[PDB]
């Protein structure tokens, strides 16, 4: 189907404990394929998926240099941000970045992304047009003015429409056996009495990839959104994901409940009941 490539960068200051740590992780869909950490003994762009390992020394050396420079760039950013908000030198602060591209089944660009958050709050983002910025506050307007003056958006646009898309297409080809394989959820329904008159039904989805899934309970065909406990989708550690949804039902009424599962690895969506 469609695919995404994203880098997720975190820079965090730590006054009195050295310079800010910079870590960058790269993903294709829900699969991490690279990491860089300024706190590593020898900071280097490192492979984290088997299909990226075939890239030669030039790939690793060039990306390493870009990330070493990005470490310094993010430290400059943190200094500037502290000033934009009139903040003390005493506190720790966090700058996060997300950038990359989405492509369709045919490998054509759907859209690009390049956005930033400071201390967990959206700060500035490149608009979908890849030409203009949206600034969250008067501090981010300073960044916007600087980036407009330096025509930064033009550089980001060229990267996102060219380099990003071209490398994503290559990764998808090289990792086709996994990146383009949807593994369906293995499902079952459990039943546990909680008292004489109530029981919980829990619907399980295990071993699926990618993480996107829909898991719902219905009673007599009506969605039970308010009465369903739904845990966050969680990684198993073997590339796959897990999720469950539970409802408390009156004893004897179990067969009025159906669990519905939608996922791209399924031939057809599932309707499950207890037993």
């Amino acid at each position: 189907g469609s695919h995404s490539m994203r880098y997720f960068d975190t820079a965090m200051s730590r006054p009195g404990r050295g310079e800010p740590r910079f870590i960058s992780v790269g993903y294709v869909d829900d699969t991490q394929f690279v990491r860089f950490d300024s706190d590593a003994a020898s900071p280097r762009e490192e492979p984290r998926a088997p299909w990226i390992e075939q890239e030669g020394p030039e790939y690793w050396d060039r990306n390493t240099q870009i990330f070493k420079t990005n470490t310094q760039t993010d430290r400059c950013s943190l200094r500037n941000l502290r000033g934009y908000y009139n903040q003390s030198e005493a506190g720790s602060h966090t700058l996060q970045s997300m950038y990359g591209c989405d492509v369709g089944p045919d490998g054509r660009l759907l859209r690009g992304h390049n956005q930033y958050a400071y201390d967990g709050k959206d700060y500035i983002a490149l608009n979908e047009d890849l030409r203009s910025w949206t600034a969250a506050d008067t501090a981010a307007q300073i960044t916007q003015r600087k980036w407009e003056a330096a025509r930064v958006a033009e550089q980001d646009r060229a990267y996102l429409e060219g380099t990003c898309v071209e490398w994503l297409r290559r990764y998808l080809e090289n990792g086709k056996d996994t990146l383009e394989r949807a593994d369906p959820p293995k499902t079952h329904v459990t039943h546990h009495p909680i008292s004489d008159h109530e029981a919980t039904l829990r619907c399980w989805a295990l071993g699926f990839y990618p993480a996107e899934i829909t898991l719902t309970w219905q009673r007599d065909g009506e969605d039970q959104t308010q009465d369903t406990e739904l845990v966050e989708t969680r990684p198993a550690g073997d590339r796959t994901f897990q999720k469950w949804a539970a409802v408390v039902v009156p004893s004897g009424e179990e067969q009025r409940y159906t669990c519905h599962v939608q996922h791209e690895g399924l031939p057809k969506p599932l309707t499950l009941r207890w037993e």
Partner: peptide
Amino acid sequence: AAAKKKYCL
């Protein structure tokens, strides 16, 4: 190169 050059905020 695959990784993006970043710009100081």
